[model samples]
Target chain A: RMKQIEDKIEEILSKIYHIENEIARIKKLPCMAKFGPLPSKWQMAPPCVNKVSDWKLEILQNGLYLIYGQVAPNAPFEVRLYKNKDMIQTLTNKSKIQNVGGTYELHVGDTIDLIFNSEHQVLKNNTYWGIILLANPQFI
Target chain B: RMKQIEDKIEEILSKIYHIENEIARIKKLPCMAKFGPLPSKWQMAPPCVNKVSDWKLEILQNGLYLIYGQVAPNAPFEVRLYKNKDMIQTLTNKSKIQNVGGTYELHVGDTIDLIFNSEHQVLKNNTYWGIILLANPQFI
Candidate 1:
């Protein structure tokens, strides 16, 4: 009888361990972050980390990410997105508003950067750059 | 001994039931949807459902959702968002671009509509409306 009880306890502990692991996995899932309507007077800056000129995000996980940018320039200008040093997307202002969005596969330590030329004024309160880690790469 | 064995099996079944229910609960969580850039000629239509003059989305779940819209008009115009005939947000073109975003508690059967006055041409490939189910209302 005692042996049977011990086996039951062992089975219960195993299931509890499984549940705990699932909770941890879900907690580790990627998140979302949005940055900026730049200052009223154009200031050259990235959206984060108190940095000026060097606008970059260092990736912390391997996943598919939804990255996007919006900009309203006083004069027509380009909004460029770079993965490290290679340009990945360039949004040009052919009309009043300029915006770009796409999903990309990113790995740990891969950096995403937002670049803009300092020649024109980027309008206030209508510019933004944001990202959402959509999911891990799918095999199924 | 037999009774002890039966008790252990019952406990194991209960734990399995808990895990099954948790999986089902997560599957029922809310989702996301994005509507699009209007046609090149500026067609008067909603992004979905193939209907003109009736741009609406019927909510399928009750949760906290992040809703946003971006638009560029040839002439300065307003982009209105409504919840079942009640105006919830109005994004006005102050300069070159116009956009609005916020979070709200949404319920099933509640409809979201995008309304334009049809007075100006909205730029093609530079406008969008989207939503993401952030999460249920927070109590903590």
Candidate 2:
């Protein structure tokens, strides 16, 4: 009886190990985009109009592009994408960047333009920024 | 064997159908707000400070108020209950307008203040704006 119990325990441990390995493999699969840090000079600027200066692009999957940024709160900002002077997309919002970070998806071959308005003095300066673009290869 | 095969097919079909339905629902939902092409003079004129204009409100089951503009992106916006001005709530990005237009959920007697900043160029020039109010009826 003792030997049988020991065998059962070993079998369960083996199964658990196998499941853990499988989960790690699944997580590493290329279903998400990846990015890097922004330039250092952009990081030191005041939060007024120069809040967002650094950005990185990563492609995740088809049709979903994740553009993440490190943004300061109450900083009026706009981001525009264009191809050879023809604007593709534009986003302007006020201070949605406080205390948290998020994603914005985009398509392939799309040039991006980011602008930070340096007018408001009420908010602080300097925030980190990053972006990831998830796109379908087939669509490209 | 036949029964198992039939069950498997049914499960696959149901999953596909459910995904399609969800996509359709998401497509039908309004993801952006629209404001009007107000007269050119009004577009150029300063809006009344601390006053609401071109407002629409809706109540939702969840305790959230979504306020936007029909002629401008609701700026300097505020919301309060008529019974208690002290209970006024401010808007934030977390309290964003839903993709659907002008649909906000509010408790009874909650007066929404869709105020605009006449001094701000962005607020005074826009043609369309809206606001939504989500209220905790129980709290009121």
Candidate 3:
């Protein structure tokens, strides 16, 4: 019995150590383009995204883009990114008791097109916290 | 002897659980924009910084600015940040042959003026690589 417990403990120990290292690796890279605490309702283009023409102004050399969002604690939040009308990425977090957000890394081409949306059209006056778009410089 | 082993195993097991939880917490907050091939260097505006005017265009409601540079594998590198000719933030990295960068949070009032420089008469033909300044937005 002691031998089996010892092996099990060793296995768990290894797994958790790896997890700790991975966590250390992530905390170094933070979020970006963070926005809003006012009215986190489900609006197509208010809190996270504003106007389709705005992203057009954000032009950069092709690289990894970190996209993140804050999903409200009252309704489901849906987000989408479009490259000239063709949707490229879509994610929805189903929760409301606690705020929700997700991080996504994407390779962007020459042209840039983006949009943040939701189906909960301003759910019961509850606020969705934030949204972000970050670009990491690529090493050559 | 068996009891001692079991106690030690249990201790390791407990430590692993906490590490696992910590890892999960950190994954939720990924590392800041990470980019490199493993090397850090130091020097002033030569390769990365073009002129004082370029940063003028990057002014926004700043919270944290990610300052980075290419520290060639040769001498020590020192970096300085100046606002309206007043030295505000200064950092020194005593190493070369590494890529080093950091995120600094700041609050600026009125007009924004920034100048990044170093001490090395442009720091030998090592080129000093360059420097970067990135700003993060504040909540509304």
How does candidate 3 fare on TM-score? 0.26
Interface RMSD score of candidate 2: 16.0
A1-140, model 3: which lDDT tens digit per residue?
A: 86787787678778777876776777655233433334432223112234324333232334454333333333445655554556666546544222233233433333334344644432433333333445555651
Global lDDT of each candidate:
0.61, 0.36, 0.41
Q: What are the DockQ scores of the candidates, in order? A: 0.12, 0.03, 0.15
Instruction: Using DockQ as the measure, name the better of candidate 1 and candidate 2.
Output: 1
RMSD of each: 10.3, 15.0, 20.4
Off by over 4 Å in 3: A30-140, B20-140
lDDT of 3 by residue, B76-107 (tens): 44554444444434445555443333333334
* Per-residue lDDT over B28-129 for candidate 2, one digit per residue giving the tens place of the 0 to 100 score: 431122233344221111111122234322222334443333222345443322212433333332233311123344454444433333424223444333
Best-matching candidate per lDDT: 1
The collision pairs in model 1 are none
What TM-score number comes out for model 2? Answer: 0.28
Relative to the unseen true structure, what is the C-alpha lDDT of residue B36 in candidate 3, on a scale of 0 to 100?
Answer: 26
